[PDB]
Structure formats: C-alpha cells, structure tokens
A paper describes a structure:
The crystal structures of Fab 13G10 and Fab [name] were determined at 2.05 Å and 2.55 Å, respectively. Fab 13G10 crystallized with one molecule in the asymmetric unit, whereas the crystals of Fab [name] contained eight Fab molecules in the asymmetric unit and were pseudomerohedrally twinned. Fab 13G10 and Fab [name] display large elbow angles of 175.3° and 170.1°, respectively, in agreement with their light chain belonging to the λ-class. However, the fit is better for the VL and VH domains taken separately, with an rmsd of 0.54 Å2 over 89 Cα atoms and 0.92 Å2 over 85 Cα atoms, respectively. This reflects a difference in the orientation of the VH and VL domains of the two antibodies with respect to each other of 8.04° and 0.61 Å. In [name], electron density is observed for CDRH1 only for four molecules in the asymmetric unit out of eight and it adopts a very different conformation from that in 13G10, which has not yet been listed. This is a consequence of the four differences in amino acids in this CDR between the two antibodies. CDRH3 in both antibodies does not share the same conformation because of the flexibility of the main chain due to the presence of three glycine residues. In the 20 first solutions with low energy for the [name]/Fe(ToCPP) complex, the porphyrin is always located in the solvent-exposed region of the binding site. This leads to very variable orientations of the cofactor with weaker complementarity to the antibody than in 13G10.
In order to generate antibodies with peroxidase activity, mice have been immunized against iron(III)-α,α,α,β-meso-tetrakis-orthocarboxyphenyl-porphyrin (Fe(ToCPP)). Two antibodies, 13G10 and [name], were found to bind the porphyrin hapten with nanomolar affinities and enhance its peroxidase activity. 13G10 and [name] are murine monoclonal antibodies that were found to belong to the IgG1, λ-class. The anti-porphyrin antibodies 13G10 and [name], with a λ-light chain, were shown to possess shallow hapten binding pockets compared with the other structurally characterized catalytic antibodies.
Residue numbers in the entry:
A (entry chain A): 6 to 99, 101 to 218
B (entry chain B): 1 to 212
Amino acid sequence: QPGPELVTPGASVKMSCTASGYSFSSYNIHWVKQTPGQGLEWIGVIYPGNGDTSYNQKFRDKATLTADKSSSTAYMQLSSLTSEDSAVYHCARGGSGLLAYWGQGTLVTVSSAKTTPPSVYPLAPGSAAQTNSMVTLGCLVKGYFPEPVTVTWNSGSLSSGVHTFPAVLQSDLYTLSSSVTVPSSTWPSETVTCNVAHPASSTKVDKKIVPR
Amino acid sequence: QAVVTQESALTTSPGETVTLTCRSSTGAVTTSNYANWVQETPDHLFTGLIGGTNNRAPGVPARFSGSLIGDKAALTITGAQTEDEAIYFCALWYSNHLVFGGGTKLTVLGQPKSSPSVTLFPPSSEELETNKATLVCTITDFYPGVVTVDWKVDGTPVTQGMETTQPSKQSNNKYMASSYLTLTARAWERHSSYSCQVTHEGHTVEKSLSRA
C-alpha cells in the first residue's frame, strides 16, 4: 500500500506481483528497480518453495519479500521511503535461474512537493516551417505535479497528426507539449482545440488557437 | 559490487546474424556467472530470454541463443527480424548478488531512413505576462531513433536553459521528440533570432524564427 504512485517521505509501501503467469511454476521470484539514470537494479529474489530469500546489500534493510501458495501471491514491502525510491518496481517470474515472465510495472513517486494545477498556452505557427505545407498546431502544458495529464483535439474528432510528447522534469514540475496537424481548409479559417485535463487536482482547459 | 559493461548500440538488417557481448571488469565471464539476458521493447514491456549462460526461456524463438565467446558472455540472434529492434539488457551473478549491465540498443533496419521534420514555436503572449518565455521545438518522423539537438540565438549558440525529451516510437514505427528553450520575457524582447538545430545521421535539419 499503496499504488496510486504518490506517497509521503518516511512512509512504507507494499506492492504485489500479479498477471497470468499460470499455475505450474514460479520456482523463483525476482524484483527489479528501474530508474532514469541508475538503470536496472536488482533488489532480491524469493524462492516460494521453502521461503529462502536473497537480498542486495543496498536494499537489505528497506526491502521485505513474502509469498504464499494459496492465492499465488508475491509481495514486496518497502519502508523508510525517501525520494530516492522513486522508480518503476517490476516483478520477474520464472523457473530455476530464469527471469522468464515480467509484470506490468508499478510506478512509485515519493516527494514533498505540493499539488500544482497546470496552465496551458497556445502555440501559433508563424515563420518556422511545418513539413508538406498543412498547418501544425499545439499547446504547452507547463508546471504541474504530479502526473499525468490528458490532451485531446477537436473534442476527440481530430485524430491523426497528433503528437503528444512525454513530459520532461523541469525543476520539481512536469512539462509536456502536444502537436497536431490539419489542412489550411481548417486553420486559420475554422476551429482547433485542445483540451488539457489534469486528474490529481482536477482541471479542464479550452484554448482556441487564434493566429499571430 | 563489480561493474558490467555492454556495447552501447549496434545496427543490422533482417536476415543477418548479430552478436552482443557482456564484459566483466573484475576478471572474465565464466560458466559460474550464470549469464542472464532480458529484452526491453521500446514500449517498455520486458521479456526474459536466456538464463544459466545458454538456456532459452520457454517461448523464446529459436533465433535467440546464448554462449561464451572467449572471456565474455554473448547473445546471438541468427536471422534477425524487424521486431528485434529493441534494448537488450545483460545480467551476471556474483556469489549472491545480481549486477545488471547498461543495456544495448539494437537497431534493425526494417524501413527506409528518414530525415526528421522540425517545427518551432515562439512564446505565447500570456506567458510573457508572467515574465517567462518558452520556445518549443517539435521533432517528428525520423528513423533510426537517435537525435541530438542544439539551440542558437541571434546566430550564436546557447547551451543554457535547454531541455530535450527522449525518442519515443510513433504509430508508423518511426520516432518523435521535442525540446524547450526557456528565457525571460525581457530576454525575449532583447534579442532577435532563434534557431533549433536537429542533427540526424550526419545531416542537420534547421528551423529558425525571427521576432518580426
């Protein structure tokens, strides 16, 4: 507990490994930590056969592995949560000496950061080319925490040409862009929009891409 | 904790045979290291391939195989496919401690190479009211998926206040990216030219705008 990703510094999370790895095996169960920079880190392995656990020296005091043969469960419980533990914790099922099956991937975010609503700014074209003529438009979603946000175009009518780029961390705050492309028979003549919604604190914005 | 080294990147064509290696700084890679090989698809899915130096996980195609080349652990893909273009991670055992490698990003030429299309946006008027200015440069439709970006103000290079996203795969199996150059609204009115330079495979695509 829990898995909506956001937790307080000093808390203690507990995750579970579940999928359709089907009955039969699971002789060993590994746990992997993925993070932008440190890459893949091995926390430890549990052998559900008799309980035997192995831990990385780095995570021996912070990680605890349990598993039962009743509901095919396999848990990891962290504690003393620092913002260093902000990562994607994976699970790896398989037979003897095999990282065969991998799970979904539980996202974990540890931060003392306050919740901040996003602000959206329109991005007019101008003298900066967009390929094959047409009209490329977009919005700038800047300064929100935490993730994610959802961007649509023409109330959902407008697919194709849409390019919602991933968010770059920009000093404790997230920021992403999202381009879209329509013919000149739509812009600047008629409507283009652009709905950036932000779950965690709720927000809904409408931006008419008015020309420069 | 020893360190595990892999090749940064390799490129090949379908039908060809490619060999990836896995080096250990603290001596050589023997049979007692129980070499592991995990694949990560650009959609971040994670699938286990090899365990115990040369044991294919159940379900892995016959084109994958592991072995020891001299003093290094190796992965061999004979008859590579277009679907094999992904990042491959290596893992070596040490007493009771599993160390992962940096990973090898393999590119498989399944489609013709393509120069990226670049769009550049000037800061919006609303953000200027907050004494901030953010130029947005969108980079889409390029292959292979490796791109470096540089910025230029008034024809002169700026390496400050820049931020570029990592390449993510598009729906047409191409790649896309973006970059942001943040300045003050004061600096936005105290210079003239702005340029976003995208270098892909020796060639440079450049898009500029002048406040006029």
